[PDB]
Design an enzyme around this catalytic site. Structure first.
Site, short mmCIF file in Angstrom:
data_model
loop_
_atom_site.label_atom_id
_atom_site.label_comp_id
_atom_site.label_asym_id
_atom_site.label_seq_id
_atom_site.Cartn_x
_atom_site.Cartn_y
_atom_site.Cartn_z
N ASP A 284 -37.63 28.37 -7.12
CA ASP A 284 -37.82 27.25 -6.21
C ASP A 284 -39.33 27.18 -5.92
O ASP A 284 -40.09 28.06 -6.32
CB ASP A 284 -36.99 27.37 -4.91
CG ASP A 284 -37.13 28.72 -4.20
OD1 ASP A 284 -38.23 29.30 -4.19
OD2 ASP A 284 -36.11 29.19 -3.65
N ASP B 153 -26.67 26.51 -7.02
CA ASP B 153 -27.18 27.80 -6.57
C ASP B 153 -26.80 27.92 -5.10
O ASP B 153 -26.74 26.92 -4.38
CB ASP B 153 -28.71 27.89 -6.71
CG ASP B 153 -29.46 27.25 -5.54
OD1 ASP B 153 -29.66 26.03 -5.56
OD2 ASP B 153 -29.84 27.98 -4.61
N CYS C 228 -8.15 37.12 -10.99
CA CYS C 228 -9.56 37.33 -11.32
C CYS C 228 -9.68 38.45 -12.35
O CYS C 228 -9.03 39.49 -12.24
CB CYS C 228 -10.34 37.69 -10.06
SG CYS C 228 -12.05 38.19 -10.34
N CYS D 217 -12.54 40.19 -13.08
CA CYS D 217 -13.72 41.03 -12.87
C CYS D 217 -13.37 42.52 -12.81
O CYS D 217 -12.22 42.89 -12.56
CB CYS D 217 -14.51 40.59 -11.63
SG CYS D 217 -14.03 41.34 -10.04
N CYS E 76 -11.64 43.80 -9.58
CA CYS E 76 -10.21 43.52 -9.47
C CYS E 76 -9.36 44.33 -10.44
O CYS E 76 -8.15 44.45 -10.26
CB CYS E 76 -9.95 42.03 -9.64
SG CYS E 76 -10.55 41.06 -8.25
N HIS F 147 -17.48 40.85 -7.29
CA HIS F 147 -16.28 40.04 -7.36
C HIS F 147 -16.59 38.57 -7.08
O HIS F 147 -16.17 37.70 -7.84
CB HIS F 147 -15.21 40.52 -6.38
CG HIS F 147 -14.16 39.49 -6.11
ND1 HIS F 147 -13.19 39.14 -7.03
CD2 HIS F 147 -13.99 38.64 -5.06
CE1 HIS F 147 -12.49 38.12 -6.57
NE2 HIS F 147 -12.96 37.80 -5.38
#
Ligand SMILES: CCCSCc1cc(N)cc2c(=O)[nH]c(N)nc12
Ligand SMILES: CCCSCc1cc(N)cc2c(=O)[nH]c(N)nc12
Ligand SMILES: [Zn+2]
Ligand SMILES: [Zn+2]
Lengths: 372, 372
Positions: free
Chosen positions: B92, B270, B308, B310, B313, B339
């Site tokens: 930014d 974002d 999920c 990931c 999980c 996660h």
């Protein structure tokens, strides 16, 4: 593998190297055990702890009986399942941290009553309750519940605590044996007391051996007596313990303390030094520890240690970690902790290899020359 | 790959899916960019950020110019090398966080002067200095330096800020182009302003397109106007931007906001929501977010989310993470953050796939029915 089997593959002087086979895995000795306080080795996933070379970790019973609860952890499937570590776990009795961290501790021959430093609740830990809690946690190596003696201690007070500890050792042994599942799958370590007095250490060693344990810890040290005194006590204390069983020095972790302790017959170690090091900014190197927060590291592109093979030293610079720590970033803690535990595991590996190759004495000398 | 190439592979209504090819990698759109504040995506190693599916991350220029320093990072080899992320990084301009986090901000046509909220030092950020700082960081996608308009804003104040921003957009463009290395390896995005006023948004869009940029951001939203108003503004604002260039909605991250924004033509997002979620205990699930600290999760063996994929999980329960967060353990933050970012990346993947398969509208409907 068997429930418990300690075999010594090599020796050099009082130093030994070998393995302890247990149902959940093999432990290479001398071993260093990372400390998992509240069911977690500070800032590291269990897989990362294993990646550093750790064969076993320690679980703090005091914290666990308080925060999530022993019964709750049992209902959830045990500590191994709960935290995701499937290898051996040694759990302390909880008695030491009770005398250190809890409030209004009322002691007696039955055990200890105390108030939580968290919720301010009350609990009555005893040889029987401690053994039970460690069983509920699903511990592989169970520590007998004892009474730690404060430093400095008078001969009469040291004798009284040691004597009580031996009575409590018998109670721990019986409690452990009466629980079939625990006696058949776990191991029990006894703890030698007696402060800095040789006669007391001898009486404790004999009492412990008389009862019989899978391993023997040298308790009451690293409580403010200094390295010289600690080594002097170890000189006559370790030989008193059964030679064919593991020797565990509780709460000892400075690299130099470990080297000297192994030279005196110690096979197992544990300490919060590695984890707390990467909290205030201390990183271990073969040239001695460094405080990464120091301004001289702000633009240092070299890794934490020049020869360390950990993932941290392969991927990041001192400059980056310096920034992270000063910024109070979590990744700073993660990286410092991983490196420190990896450094300790590499130290243990160099110790094991040197003993196996009959050059441990030379290793100790070279290690000290460069580290100091 | 080329310096910059955006190609749209599929469409459905105003929604688009495709890729942005850059020297450091390919970015799949719609894309979600994890936020790296002080050269670190909170509590995650760069490899873990990548494992979740992220193709690009955002770097905060304000924090970086202060804490380690832009010049220092350049001397150290650039942000990519410094933090260990070798894929694209969007930075930014630093102007927004100056108006939010710094003290005694003195604004003018030249730029902004301000005092650090850290050391209390002073800096003079301008279109030229901002572009230079992003170059020193080694940014792949450079944001033009603008003046964000506060909500609510009167037509005259919104017009003045938008007009200044357009003058600053021309200055950013020229500064970027005059630096050969940056113009040849990086990309520049312009930012549309105009608050909630359609005529202003149109004037801003025309001015930006007249100058010409690699991508166009819709600025001035997610500043307290609410989702309804945000969507209404996006309805007429996104169509004003060049169709063949990426559309970036700055600081927008709630799952439902993302879905609605994509339906309106946004290609990039974002937000700190994912990272800050696993700070107060918020975990995203397909059935809506949950606060893991709640007592109902103390003995819940199920993972954070039932589908999920990931690592968190796969390996840990809600009960364990509940304990970690309540204990204030670093691993709690690490696990929750991994996660959440993984959940966001899975959301973007489901969005991209549904657009490519012409069933995005049905996906949005099903997503909302279950999420609310
Ligand atoms: C983090 C705690 C694990 S090691 C604790 C410890 C450390 C030291 N130095 C001595 C003792 C002791 O004598 N008894 C017990 N139970 N524990 C001791
Ligand atoms: C963490 C900061 C990255 S996104 C910041 C942001 C967020 C929102 N909502 C609007 C704006 C804007 O108008 N201009 C700029 N530079 N930034 C904005
Ligand atoms: Zn290292
Ligand atoms: Zn998950």
């Amino acid at each position: 593998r068997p429930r418990f089997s300690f075999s010594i593959a090599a020796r050099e002087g009082k130093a030994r190297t070998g393995t302890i086979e247990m149902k959940r895995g093999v432990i290479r000795t001398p071993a260093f055990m990372p400390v998992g306080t509240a069911a977690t080795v500070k800032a590291l996933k269990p897989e990362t702890v294993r990646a550093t070379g750790a064969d076993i970790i320690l679980g703090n019973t005091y914290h666990l009986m308080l925060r999530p609860g022993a019964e709750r952890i049992a209902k959830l499937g045990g500590l191994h399942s709960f935290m995701g570590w499937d290898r051996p776990i040694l759990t302390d009795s909880g008695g030491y941290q009770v005398m250190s961290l809890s409030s209004l501790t009322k002691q007696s021959e039955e055990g200890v009553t105390f108030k939580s430093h968290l919720d301010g609740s009350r609990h009555m830990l005893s040889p029987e309750r401690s053994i039970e809690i460690q069983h509920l946690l699903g511990s592989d190596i169970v520590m007998a519940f004892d009474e730690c003696t404060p430093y400095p201690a008078t001969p009469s007070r040291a004798a009284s605590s040691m004597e009580r500890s031996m009575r409590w050792a018998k109670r721990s042994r019986d409690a452990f044996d009466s629980r079939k599942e625990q006696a058949e799958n776990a191991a029990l370590f006894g703890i030698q007391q007696g402060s800095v007095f040789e006669n007391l250490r001898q009486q404790s060693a004999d009492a412990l051996a008389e009862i019989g344990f899978d391993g023997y810890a040298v308790g009451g040290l690293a409580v403010g007596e200094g390295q010289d005194e600690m080594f002097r006590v170890l000189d006559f204390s370790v030989p008193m313990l059964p030679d064919d069983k593991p020797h565990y020095l509780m709460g000892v972790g400075k690299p130099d303390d470990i080297v000297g302790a192994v030279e005196r017959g110690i096979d197992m170690f544990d300490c919060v030094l590695p984890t707390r090091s990467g909290r205030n900014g201390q990183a271990f190197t073969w040239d001695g520890p460094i405080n990464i927060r120091n301004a001289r590291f702000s633009e240092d592109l070299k890794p934490l240690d020049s020869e360390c093979h950990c993932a941290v030293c392969q991927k990041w610079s001192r400059a980056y970690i310096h920034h992270l720590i000063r910024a109070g970033e979590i990744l700073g803690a993660m990286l410092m902790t991983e490196h420190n535990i990896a450094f300790y595991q590499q130290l243990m590996q160099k110790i094991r290899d040197s003993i196996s190759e009959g050059r441990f004495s030379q290793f100790a000398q070279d290690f000290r020359a460069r580290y100091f």
